[PDB]
């Protein structure tokens, strides 16, 4: 019944994916999906007084180079609740290494918030906002002794290539028969 395994990656992949939100914007508690049960679990409380700048979660039925479900960040005006499904349009991708692992993260906007109707690529996002997101990931685990390195941002096309790669990695990981 774990929604990570049960939900499809999206209704029109990779143009529109499902984002399963784990962490609402504004939260200092780092939630994740419990792997066994699919419940929400507290992974940690962030060691610094930082908050997630985006709603944050995973794309169902994906896996990635870092040995986790593929991360997705959805820009929401009003945060959602954990375990909410958002139909999301990928617009770019944050390129980072986290303790040496290729922990990249899709950046997306909600299809059904008209505020974002003309946001289709990484160039549509205010620079200071991209900088704030990157800085969060650069520093949020500094007090835990972790080395993170932000490479930069890729465009919507690159995000979509990576989503398709992650859908394939899930099939290989869990032995899914086409």
């Amino acid at each position: 019944m774990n929604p990570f395994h049960e939900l499809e990656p999206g209704p029109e992949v990779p143009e529109v994916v499902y984002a399963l939100i784990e962490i609402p914007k504004g939260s200092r508690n780092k939630y994740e999906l419990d792997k066994k049960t699919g419940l929400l679990k507290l992974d940690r409380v962030l060691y610094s007084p930082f908050f997630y700048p985006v709603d944050y979660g995973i794309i169902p039925q994906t896996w990635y180079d870092d040995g986790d479900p593929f991360d997705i960040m959805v820009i929401m005006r009003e945060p959602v609740y954990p375990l909410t499904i958002i139909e999301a349009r990928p617009i770019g991708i944050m390129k980072m290494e986290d303790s040496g692992d290729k922990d990249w993260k899709v950046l997306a906007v909600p299809v059904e918030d008209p505020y974002f109707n003309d946001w289709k690529d990484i160039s549509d996002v205010p620079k200071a906002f991209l900088d704030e997101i990157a800085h969060f990931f650069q520093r949020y685990k500094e007090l835990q002794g972790k080395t993170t390195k932000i490479e930069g941002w890729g465009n919507a096309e690159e995000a979509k290539r990576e989503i398709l790669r992650a859908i394939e990695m899930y099939k290989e990981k869990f032995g899914k028969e086409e």
Copy 2:
């Protein structure tokens, strides 16, 4: 595992029903239950800076003329979280057409909040509050080009007739064997 299908319509229908809340009072995000999975899903962000004036959701194992689960609005002092069950006493019904469809909505109070112990019928509700609810539905989809028409309010008896009709429509819709 979709709670819309699994939960009973109520413990003492139609005098007391279960309200499965999708949208907490105060939310501009319009959540609904995903039909396939039963997870919470973002349907849309409202196009106007309005908020749901009531906790809003559905009665399990109901269906209605508009091709959806039967809508219920519960008056709560402190909003609940999405996917919370409230034992609710129907006190009236909002009569409206939404794009030509008979989209009526039960108005109810929580059985277990003593604040509302003497609220048993539509006449117990402040007029301005009924007007605020009606006005929300009159205008919340105006920027989406939708025609809605508020007819008025029915009493507790009429709400209860409609609940029993909706319980029957669900059985017919999903081929339930008595």
Copy 3:
């Protein structure tokens, strides 16, 4: 000390003005600065479940055709508290009438939030956001039996010429 009279209209008028916020984004309570004392006052509770879509207030030492200080709307990500001063860059103006009075409202962004650094004119705002603000003013007083008429949006140059006109109306009214 009544901040409407004590504060200047801005540090670099009309390119940068001071916005004295009365109503934080997200409020359904309609607060105003009390004319007499300068304290925050509850004017009303909105009759509908609407909330202010922007941080809303006044430009100090202004007056306007509707017999009030000139209104200003500041787009803020995190709302401020009532009676907070924000250095604000006008980027456009909502043209409307309220109960038959000309009641236009400046739209502005905070100078000191870098998110908005490239917002300089009305074309920089998402359409749907302008539509949501206009719709709020179109309908928020409907249950009070009041009529508003929304004309549309003017640009930053219009907004600035209106700010100057409102500064001179304050001198006309209170000056001397």
Copy 4:
């Protein structure tokens, strides 16, 4: 400017009074207006996980048997910010003693929230809500070793006669 002394008790005393809110509904921090400066001050943090069930404050230019401004409770759907003025219609009065002093508290509704238009007397309030307010005052200082004694609720006519008495106590105390 100390608003307790500067503001009038009301626009139409005792039918409509001004409530100067100190504590928004939902607070566990007990704020007061500082006697000296008129700024908001933290008096204490309540010793128990209780929150004020009403917007709580004072009527300006009043005094009372307990050596404080006369207390007022305003029922608000959305809480206000501290130091907000609310035009309030008294509808009853909580009769209690606090540490042996007569410390009654007016119960009022906002004139400008139409939700409360038909709330005019103590019989218009749900019983359970009156019970919750009384229980708050019965127990909120228990861990401080303080004794409160709740007598019961008086009606709107009592409340108004007490407001007039408190207005005259302010003149007795500060008058001249």
Copy 5:
């Protein structure tokens, strides 16, 4: 699919247990897990303007003398959402009778909030905080006519004995085969 039955009591019982949170700190709504479905349900609205001083919930696969899942209180700086799993370190136990029933409650801290790293026993908690918790339970059902009696606090060792007893009572209650 009821997580009370599906989740294990903890990853390292009784030193570390899972706390399944029902009620976030700050809530006046008293939520519980629906027994049949595992959904969140509104049990009541508290009759007084009190709020839960701790995140409050249950340890999975436990049962207690009072005929309920064993209660656990987790001290969180930022409240979690209902149905969140917290890995929790027991540090003491609140001893109370509620309408004559032995309704004791584990007090615990999150393993993964470093703020609490040196909280290991009841003596690490500020006295006023223990007093506030006890006073809440002493008075929160006073308007419902219920007699509650707070005995005091036991230490971490006693809390852990009681957790193991509750794990056994669950096996006996639901006929679990070792």
Copy 6:
């Protein structure tokens, strides 16, 4: 009335000081008291998704090496509103430089929250909490290109000697 100048530094300096809060815990908006008028002003929005980990403000009638009122951080469970006065017991001091200026900050607890009754010195604070505060100041202005240097934490005795020094700097600056 500008509370920075009007309020005294404390009721029992330096054992108990008045903290005039500018920024509630949890804010990303950086508010300050306006030097001119004493109103709350938005100085900036922090460039990163950081929030103030403490209620943050100033001690009235103090001045400091960095050309500002002396900063104070009050640990509060429930944040206060801006411009609230809190009676605060200093328990330590964050030693840092900001853009090359000595910009130390008192750490204090509220006298009137019994939760903190046994917090009297810097050793009473959880390590991780001191680390989180220091890290906030280490990184919160990084995207503004500003350099801060965190030296470490001093104890209650240091903090109190600094408060006295800051009280005398105010007299040096404004005195007369």
